[PDB]
Amino acid sequence: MDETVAEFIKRTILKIPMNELTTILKAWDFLSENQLQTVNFRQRKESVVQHLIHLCEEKRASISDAALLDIIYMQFHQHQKVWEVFQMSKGPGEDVDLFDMKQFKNSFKKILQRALKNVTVSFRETEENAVWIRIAWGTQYTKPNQYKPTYVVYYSQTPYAFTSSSMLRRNTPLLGQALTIASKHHQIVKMDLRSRYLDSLKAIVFKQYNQDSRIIHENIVEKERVQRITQETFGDYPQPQLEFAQYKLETKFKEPLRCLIKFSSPHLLEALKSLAPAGIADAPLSPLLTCIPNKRMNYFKIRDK
């Protein structure tokens, strides 16, 4: 029920698919149980995106909760808008005895509006104990832009704070700065982990993923070996990186020979696992390629050694 708010809600309501209309509209709380029956969710897309936004016209929707709608949309569509991983680092001392979600919301919004005075920061403390910050940016010269927001999934007391790599503007060093000063840390470092599957980045940065008689195969002693070495490097249930696992090679050919390798698969760490047994790869499959989760890194910048 406002400029860049009502039509913003319209643009985020045609984004959400028809199946999970109830799921996202129930969680953002503006449509109570009585309001759900008024609109027939099963009829049409333009019908619902017109009646629902009217149901907020009577509900006088504001950007503070319109952005929360976008948050809840992305919580089920986090597998888009490839995510950078920021890693905080406190120095020597005790941990953050005060991460009050109210205090963190204050210490983040205050620092962000200290310089980026026109931003619509909207938090959503999820049930997995990970505040799902969404930031619509805009300098003092412009209104906060909700067209391209920068969602930041900060796990509540974790040194790691995922970030939607939207545009990587001059706010990115302020995104990390506000993040590391709201949560009582000192150094913000981009881990350089950049994947589209946040549910896999969560696994990686937390190490949370692993916790006939006639056909005489003459190279059976080699197939057994290659299967063995592909089970002590890729143990069980690898997580889908699905990311351009770059290897910006700077090595001499055996002065350097610059390369910018980009492994690109819908499911990378499983694609590598089925390489050596398929004959494409050697059995010891180059730890540069096996230690993507073990190093918690895929955007490599290797050199010679």
Binding site: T251, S286, P287, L288, I302, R303, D304, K305
Partner: peptide, 5 residues
């Protein structure tokens, strides 16, 4: 080393 073999 940085296993560049």
């Amino acid at each position: 080393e940085f296993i560049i073999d």
